[PDB]
Amino acid sequence: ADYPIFSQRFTADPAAVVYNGRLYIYCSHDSDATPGQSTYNIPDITCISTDDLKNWTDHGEVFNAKRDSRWASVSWAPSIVYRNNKFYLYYGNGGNGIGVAVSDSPTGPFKDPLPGPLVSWNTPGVQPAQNMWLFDPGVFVDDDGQAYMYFGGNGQNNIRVIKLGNDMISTVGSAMTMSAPRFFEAAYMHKYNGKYYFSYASDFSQGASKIEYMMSDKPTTGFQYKGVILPQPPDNYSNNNHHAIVEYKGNWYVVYHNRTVAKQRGLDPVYQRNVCIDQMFYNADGTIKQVVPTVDGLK
Numbered sequence: 209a210d211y212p213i214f215s216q217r218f219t220a221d222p223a224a225v226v227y228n229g230r231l232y233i234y235c236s237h238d239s240d241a242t243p244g245q246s247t248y249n250i251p252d253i254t255c256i257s258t259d260d261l262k263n264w265t266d267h268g269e270v271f272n273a274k275r276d277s278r279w280a281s282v283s284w285a286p287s288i289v290y291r292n293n294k295f296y297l298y299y300g301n302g303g304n305g306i307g308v309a310v311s312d313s314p315t316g317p318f319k320d321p322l323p324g325p326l327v328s329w330n331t332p333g334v335q336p337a338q339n340m341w342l343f344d345p346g347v348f349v350d351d352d353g354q355a356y357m358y359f360g361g362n363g364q365n366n367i368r369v370i371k372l373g374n375d376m377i378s379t380v381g382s383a384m385t386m387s388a389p390r391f392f393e394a395a396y397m398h399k400y401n402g403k404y405y406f407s408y409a410s411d412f413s414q415g416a417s418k419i420e421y422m423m424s425d426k427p428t429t430g431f432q433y434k435g436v437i438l439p440q441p442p443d444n445y446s447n448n449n450h451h452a453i454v455e456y457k458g459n460w461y462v463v464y465h466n467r468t469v470a471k472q473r474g475l476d477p478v479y480q481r482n483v484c485i486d487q488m489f490y491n492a493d494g495t496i497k498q499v500v501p502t503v504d505g506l507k
């Protein structure tokens with residue numbers, strides 16, 4: 209297998225879904241660097257896929273916020289869900305609302321059907337929030353058929369979770385607050401063997417951001433911190449760290465990003481990331497073993 213897996217264009221903040229025997233990864237498309245750039249330039253979402261964890265097919269950019277929504281300008285940090293035989297791609301409009309785009313195909317075109325954000329600063333239960341980043345959705349569908357969107361940023365108590373309707377393009381009720389030590393961004397939920405795993409990127413307060421996690425018997429309460437899933441990957445310049453956890457063909461993987469492509473090309477790595485993948489394992493007690501980044505391809 210190759211490392212890096214995909215270098216055609218820069219990619220970050222992956223999310224993944226399995227459909228018809230393939231693993232699809234959706235990423236923030238980090239636009240090629242421009243002179244004067246001093247923040248993100250993520251206008252669209254890239255999708256790649258595989259059926260063998262060796263050959264990755266480039267599906268291009270499958271969602272563009274300006275082209276494919278009526279209200280959004282950017283599309284940061286996608287979350288993908290397959291439900292109702294449709295694909296729901298949630299995205300952050302740069303902190304200015306969270307959207308949802310829909311397609312009958314994993315590879316789009318995705319289109320946001322709504323006149324405005326799915327979740328906004330005015331959504332009940334979001335505020336009060338001081339210094340929150342209203343972004344970085346992580347959507348999950350529980351065994352009982354209830355979907356949840358986790359989101360937020362920039363503080364221990366700046367996580368929110370809200371129910372989504374079964375149509376996946378509406379909210380139900382109010383958002384509620386969660387807390388996780390040193391929470392910074394990248395909220396993510398998955399369930400395994402009766403446990404809920406809230407994973408996230410930590411802040412820069414005791415070193416560089418790590419992917420850390422909590423476990424609970426419940427989806428929105430009852431969490432306890434359990435440790436680190438992913439340290440800083442190699443070739444990451446002590447910068448941001450963003451992941452997804454996914455099961456594919458009976459094994460588990462963490463998809464994430466680093467800056468190895470930019471490093472090899474001598475390019476500015478801050479906003480020129482590339483997707484990565486590594487295997488993840490569970491301990492017998494259900495905790496997650498810390499992932500070991502690899503640089504010579506999946507084994």
Ligand SMILES: [Ca+2]
Nearest residue numbers: 285286345394
């Ligand atoms: Ca995410």
